[PDB]
Amino acid sequence: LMPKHIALIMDGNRRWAKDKGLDVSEGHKHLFPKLKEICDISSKLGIQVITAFAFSTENWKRAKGEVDFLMQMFEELYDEFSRSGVRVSIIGCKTDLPMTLQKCIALTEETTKGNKGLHLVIALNYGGYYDILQATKSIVNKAMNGLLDVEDINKNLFDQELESKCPNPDLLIRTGGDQRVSNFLLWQLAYTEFYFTKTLFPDFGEEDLKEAIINFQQRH
Amino acid sequence: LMPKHIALIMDGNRRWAKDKGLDVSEGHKHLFPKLKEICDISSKLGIQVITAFAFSTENWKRAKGEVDFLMQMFEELYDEFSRSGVRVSIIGCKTDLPMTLQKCIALTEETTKGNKGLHLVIALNYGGYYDILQATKSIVNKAMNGLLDVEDINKNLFDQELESKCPNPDLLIRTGGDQRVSNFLLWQLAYTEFYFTKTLFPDFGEEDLKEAIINFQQRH
């Protein structure tokens, strides 16, 4: 049966450019266009949610120039998705981002929130550790304020406090050939089927998605 | 280079028996002998830690008879590992286990704790959710008792409170063909390389381990 929620680690944009002797911006520029395409194909197949990893909390360790390029490119979010009919949410630590990107995110969420087709969750300055830590801080604050006791700390409470929520990913696709989750949705991937492909993200098409979904369906 | 810490999801014992028309106890009986063999091969290759998933918090949902068989079989832990020279620790919720198994675990840990070769961590009545929840409860208790403030909640604090500790797995091997982590070491697997094999756990040998390690080394 068709996965309701797919998680996507969009790796290989760098590499794609480097392998060809092009500068890394050439690879990064495929990010939103390819994600848009994947959203279009996915909603036709009936997939209801995509959580896509655009920028890790660890990606701040890249060269300043690259990071600055990415943060500027990410402001194309509005132009790319505002009129797509996709409902867009961002997860991750928004207040560490440039204010203009924060406004771009806030506007894109506001204008697409009424859309009732595919829901795209973009994980931008996100990590599994971060999500669990922020959820833990909120739980501690509630305990400090007499709103719950230690024995009320259960899976359902965390699911309420985490940024990536139930229903969790049925399938995770990671392009680019590495076989790690790389601090993506650690809590949420507990029972997710993993699918890894050597195919670089800019070369990942409908036939690659279909093949992953088929591989997923034949494991049932 | 050689992985210091391997995580093992020992799946396929059931299946192995069922595929042959034998009862499931016949498959389960391979668990400790095969794990012992894997420990012997692993310490010769210089691997320092193995965390092996023997019983999930979700495995209590199996037939009562099967669960009762497993809990009795697990008491063979002492006879299997006490004189092996492996240092043995159990992680998971020990106080939900039968008292005789709790005593068997406590004795096996006590008598092997001085051993300085390979460290075997057996995850028995364990799950990632459980580990994160118990760590969160301890953090909340410390906050309630004025021992820390919410902004002291960081990755290092969790690493102190979690049952499976740093250094985290370099490589995870899951036998039996399913491509999930199945609520194993969720926090600890953030950057772990995943290796999946269709080979059922009772058929998994030195050549299968070597091939996984080689596959791991060629991803560097």
Query: Could you state, in order of their start, the residue ranges of all structural domains in chain A?
Result: 1-220
φ and ψ at residue B7, rounded to 5 degrees = -100, 140
> Any catalytic annotation for residue B79?
no
- Technique used by the depositors: X-ray
> How far does chain B reach from its first CA to its final CA, in angstroms?
8
Task: Give the contacts of B117 (CB within 8 A, at least 6 positions apart).
Answer: B43, B85, B86, B87
A-B C-beta contacts closer than 8 Å? 99
What tokens appear for B189 in the block?
Answer: 């697997």
Task: Quote the Cα angle for B82-B86-B91, to 5°.
Answer: 85
Kindly provide the resolution of this structure in angstroms, with one decimal.
2.0
Q: Which of A140, A154, A190 faces B133 most closely, judged by CB atoms?
A: A154
Q: Which residue of A has its CA nearest to B58?
A: A191
How far is the C-alpha of A127 from the C-alpha of A21, rounded, in Å?
30
Measured between alpha carbons, how far apart are the two ends of chain A, in Å? 8
Tell me how crowded residue A146 is: count the other CB atoms within 10 A of its CB: 7
In whole angstroms, give the CA distance from residue A113 to residue B44: 58
**DSSP code of B6?**
E
Assigned CATH class of A1-220: alpha beta
- Is residue B20 within 8 A of residue B181, CB to CB? The reply is no
**Residue ranges in chain A assigned as alpha helix (H):** 13-19, 24-28, 31-44, 64-73, 77-81, 99-112, 128-144, 155-161, 206-217
Token digits for A12? 């290989």
Tokens of A163: 């940024």
Structure-token match 């500027």, residue found: A72
If we measure between CA atoms, which residue out of B53, B42, B56 comes closest to residue B5?
B42
- Tokens representing A88? 């867009």
Amino acid found at A173: I
Q: Please answer whether residues A82 and A153 qualify as being in contact, where contact means their C-beta atoms are separated by less than 8 angstroms.
A: no
Question: A153 to chain B: which residues are within 8 Å by CB?
Answer: 133, 136-137, 140
The H-assigned helical ranges of A45-180 are 64-73, 77-81, 99-112, 128-144, 155-161
Q: Say how far apart CA B71 and CA B9 lie, in whole Å.
A: 18
B199: helix, strand or coil: coil
Which DSSP symbol is given to B200? -
